[PDB]
């Protein structure tokens, strides 16, 4: 439509925002901004349609490779477009501590 579109948002396949806004890590602010911007890109309605957000948990305070980032990749494993961001985001965040 002329800008205002009725159906076709594909910007939030799930109110999934990471609750990591209080810790010494450095992926918390990005935690809410990375996942919210993820479904904003992804699409919701074909693959990731389901929720997906956990990476920051490990890097937040675990000392274990982005195990959670792999979990979201489990539900988003499908990937159908810029998903490369969703999967790389959860992983990119863990790339702060796990290096």
CATH of the domain at 36: 1.10.150.220
Q: Is residue 89 part of a domain?
A: yes
Residue among 80, 92, 89, 97 at smallest CA distance from 16: 89
Q: Is residue 29 part of a domain?
A: yes
State how far the Cα of 90 lies from the Cα of 57, in Å rounded to an integer: 9
Please give the residue range of the domain that contains residue 97: 18-99
Q: What experiment produced this structure?
A: NMR
Residue among 54, 53, 66 at smallest CA distance from 97: 66
Contact 12/43 with Cβ under 8 angstroms?
A: no
Please measure the distance between the N-terminal and C-terminal CA atoms of the chain and give it in whole angstroms. 44
Q: Is residue 1 part of a domain?
A: no
State how far the Cα of 10 lies from the Cα of 84, in Å rounded to an integer: 16
Q: Is residue 47 part of a domain?
A: yes
Number of independent structural domains in the chain = 1
Q: Is residue 61 part of a domain?
A: yes
């Amino acid at each position: 439509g002329p800008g205002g579109s009725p159906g076709g948002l594909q910007k939030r396949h799930a109110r999934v925002t990471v609750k990591y806004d209080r810790r010494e890590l450095q992926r918390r602010l990005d935690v809410e901004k990375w996942i919210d911007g993820r479904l904003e890109e992804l699409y919701r309605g074909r693959e990731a349609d389901m929720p997906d957000e956990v990476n920051i948990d490990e890097l937040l305070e675990l000392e274990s490779e982005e195990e959670r980032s792999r979990k979201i990749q489990g539900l988003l494993k499908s990937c159908t477009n810029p998903t490369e961001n969703f999967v790389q985001e959860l992983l990119v965040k863990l790339r702060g501590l796990h290096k």
